[model samples]
Target: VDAFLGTWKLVDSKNFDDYMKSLGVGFATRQVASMTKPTTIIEKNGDILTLKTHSTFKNTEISFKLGVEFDETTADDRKVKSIVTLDGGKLVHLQKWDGQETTLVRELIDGKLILTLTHGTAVCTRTYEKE
Candidate 1:
């Protein structure tokens, strides 16, 4: 998991708007989100893991033990409970709020970090490069 702990800069994003729409984000937030480039940082301290996203629009993070659930406020401002687990270098993240749910899968491939975000039928893929 050593390779997983690093800062990754957002290099590319696809279909992000559609994914935001599925979350019922207002038009204003969606517009800003589509234009923002976010950088992700994954860190580990003792048994805790911290996942953080930094961007011009907003910075958000969550610190928790693996396989445990915790409250998180999303970049879109959704109040949700998030759970994260890692399996075979794949980080599976799940968030739920007001009966709405979304999943994000993060995996490393060929030195690039790939993020697949899905809410219902809408999906977005983002690529990041380690820095």
Candidate 2:
């Protein structure tokens, strides 16, 4: 998990407010997220891995195989059950929620990791990079 064992900082965000609103996130919550510096730590033993997202405000952790299903709680309080796998070197995530239709895509950039959350025609992106 050398590709995931570093500190990262948030760079830019797109449609952040809208995405948050869609998830019932409030102004204060959004503000906190904007100013937050979140870090992800990933440890791997063979193909099994544990990923942890930590921030000044909250933390979330999950463990799964490269192509297996796992459950996690979103920053906005909604529970997410997702499957992740490597697709041409990029990590692809497919999430399912009851009655709602949407998914999150995560990819790596020059020194950053970009995440796009999509639901219907609405999409938001958040970027982070190694510090």
Candidate 3:
């Protein structure tokens, strides 16, 4: 859980638009996402973890306890049920929506942060660095 505590800036991403497309993300939203770089901040307080993605367009956040199911509204405006867990030094997040399920994995290696998102046949890899 703590491996993702620091503020991280998005550096690179691969197939992100396709990944979002698989989840029914709108064309304009996907284009906007492709253009905007976001900063992610993770904070823990009173046993609840809050993860925020700050962007010039719009900021998205999710707050929940580890291993607990919570309601989530995603950046693409998806209303989902989500859970997050710390497993073997990685943050594993699972989100479910209307007949769709996606997994997000975050890992820290050296000083770099790696975020991988998977849904069906599409997989997106995003790289982040501490800021």
Candidate 4:
């Protein structure tokens, strides 16, 4: 919670191919994601959290209950319901979307946030740093 209430930036990304694969974003879209600078801003109030991700390519804002289920919109514009919980002090996100086979896991480390998106045989890791 409070530990995650700050701005973060993407430093290095791994599994880039796999992430784009899951998102159904082609090479062109992947290129866009790489070139665009992504900023993650989070605000925590009590047990509730509001997250805002902004980039030259896209913008996403979501609010969710801690340790509870809530609905969210994915970057692909899909309506997904998800739950967030604390796992060993790391924030874990489990999401369910229509026509998608896998969920996403994101964690914070050293002022950076790492995202591991899984689907099929593909898994991608994207990193972010606090601002």
| C-alpha lDDT score of every prediction, in listed order | 0.88, 0.76, 0.91, 0.78
Q: Which regions of candidate 3 fall more than 4 Å away from where they truly are?
A: none
Model 1, residue pairs in steric clash? none
Leading candidate by TM-score? 3
How good is model 3 by TM-score?
Answer: 0.95
Q: Of models 2 and 4, which has the larger lDDT? A: 4
lDDT by residue for model 1 (5-116), tens:
9999988999999998887889998888888888889999998988899998888888998899999888777889989888877989999988888999999899998999
Lowest lDDT 10-mer window, candidate 2? Answer: 1-10
lDDT of 3 by residue, 4-26 (tens): 78799999999999898898888
Q: Give the distance in Å from residue 77's predicted Cα in candidate 1 to where it truly belongs.
A: 1.5
- Two-way lDDT contest, 1 vs 2, winner: 1
- Model 2 whole-model lDDT (C-alpha atoms): 0.76
> Model 3 clash pairs?
none
Q: TM-score of the candidate numbered 1?
A: 0.94
Off by more than 4 A, model 2: 1-5
Question: Across residues 15-86, which tens digit of lDDT does each residue of candidate 4 receive?
Answer: 776667666777877778767778889898776789898998999998878778887878866677788887
58: Cα error in model 3, Å: 1.7
Model 4 error, position 60 (Å): 0.3
On lDDT, the candidate that comes out on top is 3
